[PDB]
């Protein structure tokens, strides 16, 4: 019967909630009391990338820590060179409505998607020297909000149809579909080992997925509104979420709880992007206050601020080697902070 | 070095293509279209010429791009901000929906649902300045419907006859009263005319007005 299972279901939430309190031995704020602080983190705009004629919504570094991609509503996908600020490629898109980007780990491919419900994959290394579109993954029914390549053949995408999918680029069919989200999925982050990925949705929850099985291992709650960005801790045993509650939270996969919340009474706008430092000591979060904060990720003390954009900071990524942090914004400018 | 130089030359050639494309996109006119499922937005689109559908048409040497975003069926709170800076928001409402009710909801009128969507759009933080063209379609079917059915079914309070001229006018004024940004945006309401093909001309006139009165803003002559 409905009521049997429902009253049963709300009981299963109890053992989950019951055990989580029992494993809440001590607050991270108590454990990290004696770590000497990080000190003022002064970061200045080193490079400023100009050439976009609309708001930027997405950017992704390369594994080589030098090239990067950006997309905007102008319907152009540009591969930048961060060292020399010169454009390597400008990809015209068929659909001006792009909301995400990904640069393949090998650097051979780049993917973008948005309200057109399609994840288009563009081939960079091409005999005829003109980035050509390779495959169009059309199996979603809502706007794509994120996409992250695993290999040059596997790409995982998250959409507004409340589902994530893992694709096979050669065939163009969904190898697996991840369902379980009760709200619109906003962002996904792949683990360092590329075996797991967490997704954040508009239903104020984040779910840890297994890419192989296609089942959700754990689900984390604690936020009060939409989760707009998500990223793992470098060691893959933790991740952090940015929501419209203007709080960032650090969840643990082993302990299955929440560790920190990075709130300041001064901050009232919604987080648009989050990203970590190579050492995991800094949590950089791009807010809608038009600025971007840098949190001490083990003390929860806002040490540092990167205020340089006119409009909201849409995307924010750090390099693999951690030499730089680049932020995009709706003011049409990407700034490389070091 | 030499290769670096040729790289810069490449990057400049790239950019001069980004501007040339930027200046081609700026000439195009971006209309966002919204409304109910049966509004007649489908019928409006046909007169003018899954995911987000685009229609391109040219009228009197002006280029229009109409973004029928009716197929998204997701949370508008996350992707509506993508269209901030459209010239206009066309809004279609079917006048023949005053006595009905949606097949999905229990007893909320289709016309009352149209207002609820209009209230959230005209007062959306992303379209504080954006002008709204409001098309009211199916005016002839509304004439037949009103002649025999009362208007009290939708608006409980109404001082006025069951005459098309007055019946319609109550609705038009009722829709125009939704906006609290009376001093910022202009709602150009039109009654759909099938044969005249003036629905497209009214869009031309309403667009120029939003352009002319914007041009006078940035040069300070206003």
């Amino acid at each position, epitope marked *: 019967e409905l009521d049997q299972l429902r009253q049963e279901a709300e009981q299963l939430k109890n053992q989950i909630r019951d055990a989580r309190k029992a494993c809440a031995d001590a607050t991270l704020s108590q454990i990290t009391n004696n770590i000497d602080p990080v000190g003022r983190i002064q970061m200045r705009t080193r490079r400023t990338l100009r050439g976009h004629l609309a708001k930027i919504y997405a950017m992704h570094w390369g594994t080589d820590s030098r*090239l990067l991609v950006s997309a905007s509503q102008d319907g152009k996908l540009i591969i930048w060179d961060s060292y020399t600020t010169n454009k390597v490629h400008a990809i015209p898109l068929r659909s001006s409505w792009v909301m995400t980007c990904a640069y393949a780990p090998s650097g051979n491919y780049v993917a973008c998607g948005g309200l057109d419900n399609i994840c288009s994959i563009y081939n960079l290394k091409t005999r005829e020297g003109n980035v050509r579109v390779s495959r169009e993954l059309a199996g979603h029914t809502g706007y794509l909000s994120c996409c992250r390549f695993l290999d040059d053949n596997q790409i995982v995408t998250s959409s507004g149809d409340t589902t994530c999918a893992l694709w096979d680029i050669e065939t163009g069919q969904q190898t697996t579909t991840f369902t379980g989200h009760t709200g619109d999925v906003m962002s996904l982050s792949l683990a360092p080992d590329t075996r797991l990925f967490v997704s954040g949705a508009c239903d104020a929850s984040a779910k840890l997925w297994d890419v192989r099985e296609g089942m959700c291992r754990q689900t984390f709650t604690g936020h009060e509104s939409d989760i707009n960005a998500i990223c793992f801790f470098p060691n893959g045993n933790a991740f952090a979420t940015g929501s419209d509650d203007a709080t960032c939270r650090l969840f643990d996969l082993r302990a299955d709880q929440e560790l920190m919340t990075y709130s300041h009474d001064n901050i009232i706008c919604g987080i648009t992007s989050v990203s970590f430092s190579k050492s995991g000591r800094l949590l950089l979060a791009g807010y809608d206050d038009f600025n971007c904060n840098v949190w001490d990720a083990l003390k929860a003390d806002r040490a540092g601020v990167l205020a340089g954009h006119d409009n909201r900071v849409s995307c924010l990524g750090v390099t693999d080697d951690g030499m730089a942090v680049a932020t995009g914004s709706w003011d049409s400018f990407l700034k490389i902070w070091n | 070095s*030499a290769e670096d130089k*040729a790289a810069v030359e490449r990057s400049k050639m790239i950019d001069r293509n980004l501007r040339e494309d930027g200046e081609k996109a700026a000439r195009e006119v971006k209309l966002l279209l919204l409304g109910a499922g049966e509004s007649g937005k489908s019928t409006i689109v046909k007169q003018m010429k899954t995911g987000i559908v685009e229609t391109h048409f040219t009228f009197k040497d002006l280029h229009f791009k109409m973004f029928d975003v009716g197929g998204q069926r997701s949370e508008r709170k996350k992707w509506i901000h993508c269209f901030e800076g459209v010239t206009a928001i066309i809004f279609c409402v079917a006048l023949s929906d005053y006595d009905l009710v949606l097949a999905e909801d229990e007893e909320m009128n289709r016309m009352h649902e149209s207002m609820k969507l209009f209230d959230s759009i005209c007062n959306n933080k992303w379209f504080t300045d954006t002008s709204i063209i409001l098309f009211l379609n199916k005016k002839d079917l509304f004439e037949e419907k009103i002649k025999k059915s009362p208007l009290t079914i939708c608006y409980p309070e109404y001082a006025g006859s069951n005459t098309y001229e007055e019946a319609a006018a109550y609705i038009q004024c009722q829709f125009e009263d939704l906006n609290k940004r009376k001093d910022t945006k202009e709602i150009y309401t039109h009654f759909t005319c099938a044969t005249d093909t003036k629905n497209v001309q009214f869009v031309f006139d309403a667009v120029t007005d939003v352009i002319i009165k914007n041009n006078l803003k940035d040069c300070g002559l206003f």
Partner: single-chain antibody, 232 residues
Framework: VQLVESGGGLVQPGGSRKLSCSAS????????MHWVRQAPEKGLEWVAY????????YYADTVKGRFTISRDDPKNTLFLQMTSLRSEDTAMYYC??????????????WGQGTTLTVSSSDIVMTQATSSVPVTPGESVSISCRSS???????????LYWFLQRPGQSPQLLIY???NLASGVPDRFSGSGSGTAFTLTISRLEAEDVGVYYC?????????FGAGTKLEL
């Protein structure tokens, strides 16, 4: 992706002839083209270059102000206008394409070239090996020497390598030291620093017998090296 050139043949000295190279099957408009000539018995020698959209035209010392190089992007053709031909302009004129952007492989594709026979400050690259005998299945190293440190500040040692099999157009093997071209087996490798350069082949075959060349790209006018023929 073929490149074919038209013209050549026999001309009395002082005459003016035109060479046209019709690109087909790639984005010609976005490729920087060169021209490289090879004498009837001697090695390669750079002559001209045009950047993308005719933004930058360079020339060699021996042809400066004597040759005019032009492109027709709409028709995907490349032109060379030659004036007052001298006896030392007898060579096979290859047409090469190259694109310069971070991580690209310039001089990757070479045309078949045309034969032209007239009737009758520079980096200098030296490789002092010729007609080296080698047997298939053994390991061979080819050494090259420069007069100047090719290692630029940014870390790019603008030294290239090429292989010209008997009766074929030259083929890129290494586009910068410690880099490997497209379509070339893993056997070829190159390691060097500053002015000393080497090309190591682990195991070879009868397919890769022929003459090897070295080129620098640190600065124009892109002087090449002498040949290094593998003997078998």
């Amino acid at each position: 992706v073929q490149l074919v050139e038209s013209g050549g043949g026999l001309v009395q000295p002082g005459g003016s002839r035109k060479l046209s190279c019709s690109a087909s099957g790639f984005a010609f408009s976005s490729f920087g083209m060169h021209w490289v000539r090879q004498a009837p018995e001697k090695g390669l020698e750079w002559v001209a270059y045009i950047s993308s959209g005719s933004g930058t035209i360079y020339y060699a010392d021996t042809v400066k102000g004597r040759f005019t190089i032009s492109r027709d992007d709409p028709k995907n053709t490349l032109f060379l206008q030659m004036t007052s031909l001298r006896s030392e302009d007898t060579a096979m004129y290859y047409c090469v394409r190259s694109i310069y952007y971070y991580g690209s492989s310039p001089f990757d594709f070479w045309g078949q070239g045309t034969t032209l026979t007239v009737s009758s400050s520079d980096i200098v690259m030296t490789q002092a090996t010729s007609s080296v005998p080698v047997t298939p299945g053994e390991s061979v190293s080819i050494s090259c020497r420069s007069s100047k440190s090719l290692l630029h500040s940014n870390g790019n040692t603008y030294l290239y390598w090429f292989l010209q099999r008997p009766g074929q157009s030259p083929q890129l093997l290494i586009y910068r030291m410690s880099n490997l071209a497209s379509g070339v087996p893993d056997r070829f490798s190159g390691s060097g620093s500053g002015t000393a350069f080497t090309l190591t082949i682990s195991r070879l075959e009868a397919e890769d017998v022929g003459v090897y060349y070295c080129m620098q790209h640190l600065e124009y006018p892109l002087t090449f090296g002498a040949g290094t023929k593998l003997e078998l």
